[PDB]
Amino acid sequence: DREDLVYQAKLAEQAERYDEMVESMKKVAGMDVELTVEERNLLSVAYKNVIGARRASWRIISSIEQKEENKGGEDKLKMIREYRQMVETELKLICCDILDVLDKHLIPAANTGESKVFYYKMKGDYHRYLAEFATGNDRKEAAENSLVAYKAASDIAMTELPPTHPIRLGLALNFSVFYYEILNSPDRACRLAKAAFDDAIAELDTLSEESYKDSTLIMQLLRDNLTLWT
Amino acid sequence: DREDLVYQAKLAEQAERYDEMVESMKKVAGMDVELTVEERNLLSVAYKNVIGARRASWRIISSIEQKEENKGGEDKLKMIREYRQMVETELKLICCDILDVLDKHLIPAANTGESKVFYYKMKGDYHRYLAEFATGNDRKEAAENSLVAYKAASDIAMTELPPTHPIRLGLALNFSVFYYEILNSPDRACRLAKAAFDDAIAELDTLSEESYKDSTLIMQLLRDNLTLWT
Amino acid sequence: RRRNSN
Amino acid sequence: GRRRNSN
């Protein structure tokens, strides 16, 4: 199976039929074993695209709702908010699907610095995506449940992974995003962004040509945010 | 009812959720009515996108299959041909779904020069998408129905639409694509495409602004195809 | 480039 | 404004 199932998940990625890519890699996750860097990323990508679609929809749907609050038309607004919530269910369903795989199947089964830090970061992201659309004491619940799960990968990263390791750098990229977006803290976002970038500069000397490539790209993203946010 | 369905189909278009957009517009098309040009376009786009995605998948899966036949790695190609055939089924079902809708509702209840041409065009396009992935007596059967539908739309277009009319150029664009891609006939493709371009140019002197935008848009698409093809 | 169809 | 980066 598992030798095949990963190829089934590769085909879905190419076909861009991510709903299958998920199902394939959930069947690999549900083996309760050490996922290879590949399997880790294939799973990672599958859910990112699936949620991605709904997230994109949501922002757009809210763009019409806000464009019809300014326009004042409060008859369409009834159907539109009916439509945004329909998505918000899927955003709830998808997020809660993957988180459920992480704390039950993946996180327990993890036994390497990378995969340990990989999954806690992941847990942060989907709690964040929950927090992205939510309101009131629903936001604060998943906001604090992310800030914990990010801070958990942060701590395990700072001993097991070097500062130039992309998984750690992507964490800081997403964590910085968490402050600027979720907690509305533009300062701590940048400080954490620049911080993550600045610690990386030193150790690039030592790493591989392909490992230098992986690091530099995520440093560009970190820098691209700091650029945009100032 | 139709008012609600059509605004739900616009929201779907914007969220790029074309599986729901198809639902909305099929419910409209069930009412056995002459569709407004908006309903016609919304219907076309919604189905165009849903088939669109499958066709892009099929192309990409067929590529991986042909790039694994040549390399000669045969054991992995067992999964791919089931995964292609799956997509082929989804295609066959979408094409069949719209054709059933065209045959049973739209064409029967279409007493208007434009709609008639539009629907016979649509019928040809979907027979063409059937012809795309088909082989043997299948490909011949679909190609015959595709052609018959384009000649049946062309006949009606040449009598009841001026050459400027975008729906007639559209038909002329997709018919040229049929010749090029399905009959493997680049000359008749170029000759048919240009012939439509070179009729509209003349009577073009005399159009409302927003029509010139339409006519010109489709003429760019004709000129590009000729450009690409030569 | 992919030939246009409408 | 072009969109922020997340990985």
Numbering used by the authors:
A (entry chain B), B (entry chain A): 3 to 232
C (entry chain C): 7 to 12
D (entry chain D): 6 to 12
From the reporting publication:
Homodimers of 14-3-3 proteins, or heterodimers with other 14-3-3 isoforms (Chaudhri et al., 2003), bind a wide range of cellular substrates and often sequester them in the cytoplasm (Mackintosh, 2004; Pozuelo Rubio et al., 2004; Tinti et al., 2014). Most 14-3-3 substrates are phosphorylated proteins in which a consensus phosphopeptide motif is recognized by a structurally characterized binding pocket formed by 14-3-3 multimers (Mackintosh, 2004; Yang et al., 2006). We interrogated an intracellular signaling pathway frequently hyperactivated in human cancers and mediated by the enzymes phosphatidylinositol 3-kinase (PI3K) and protein kinase B (AKT) (Fresno Vara et al., 2004; Vivanco and Sawyers, 2002). Its constitutive activation inactivates the tumor-suppressive transcription factor, FOXO3a (Brunet et al., 1999; Burgering and Kops, 2002), by inducing its phosphorylation and cytosolic sequestration by factors such as the 14-3-3 protein family (Brunet et al., 2002; Mackintosh, 2004; Van Der Heide et al., 2004).
In a crystal structure, the hit peptide occupies the phosphopeptide-binding groove of 14-3-3ε in a conformation distinct from its natural peptide substrates. X-ray crystallography reveals a non-canonical structural interaction between the peptide and 14-3-3ε. Interestingly, comparison with other available crystal structures of phosphopeptide-bound 14-3-3ε revealed several structural differences. Of note are the intramolecular interactions between the phosphate moiety and the NH-guanidino group of 9J10Arg9 at the −2 position relative to pSer (i.e., pS(−2)), and the salt bridge between 9J10Arg7 at pS(−4) and 14-3-3εAsp226. Indeed, FLAG-14-3-3 co-immunoprecipitates with 9J10WT but not 9J10AMut. Significantly, there is a sharp reduction in the interaction between FLAG-14-3-3 and FOXO3a in cells expressing 9J10WT, whereas 9J10AMut fails to perturb this interaction.
